[PDB]
Amino acid sequence: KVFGRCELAAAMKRHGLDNYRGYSLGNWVCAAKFESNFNTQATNRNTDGSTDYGILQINSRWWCNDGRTPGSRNLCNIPCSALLSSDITASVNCAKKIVSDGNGMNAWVAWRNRCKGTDVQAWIRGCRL
Ligand SMILES: Cn1c(=O)c2[nH]cnc2n(C)c1=O
Structure with missing residues (x-):
């Protein structure tokens, strides 16, 4: 499934991700955007043989x-x-x-490199939430 931006925000909030460990919903939507382009079926093989x-x-x-x-x-x-x-x-x-593992959202390297510190609220702007 390829979620829309606000559709995914609503699903993440529905499942208790909004402000989970202090990370606003925009952080989670931004991370999902750059990790998967909102596609639930996204997979990517890493150099070490693991897969995301x-x-x-x-x-x-x-x-x-x-x-x-x-x-x-x-x-x-x-x-x-x-x-x-x-x-x-x-x-x-x-x-x-x-x-919750210790490093917060830095575990998602794409979040650290593309979302951290940015105007993440833009990712939920206009959404009926
Ligand atoms: C060593 N190590 C890790 O490097 C790690 N990275 C993510 N979870 C982890 N766990 C549970 C772990 O034990």
Whole structure:
């Protein structure tokens, strides 16, 4: 599923991401924009053999099981395929664990490089939320 900007903001708020760990909804929408272009089915293979899955490009080396990332963990206790669903529940629940791991949203390198410090409120501007 390719979400619209405000559609994804509303789904993220519905699932308790707005201001989760202090990160406003615009931060989450901005991260999703540059990680996946709002596409739940986005996947991207990393140099190390791990793979990033879903709207927030959650990585198989720590967070989900894809059966093909040697030495990895599955800390969200989910198959990585669950991160590709049109329903974003699994991605949101896992992202809550990631953002709580110590480094906040810096775990998403695209958030650090393209959202952090910017006018992230623009990402939810005009949305009925
Ligand atoms: C060492 N290490 C990490 O580097 C890491 N990165 C993300 N989760 C992590 N966990 C749980 C971890 O133990």
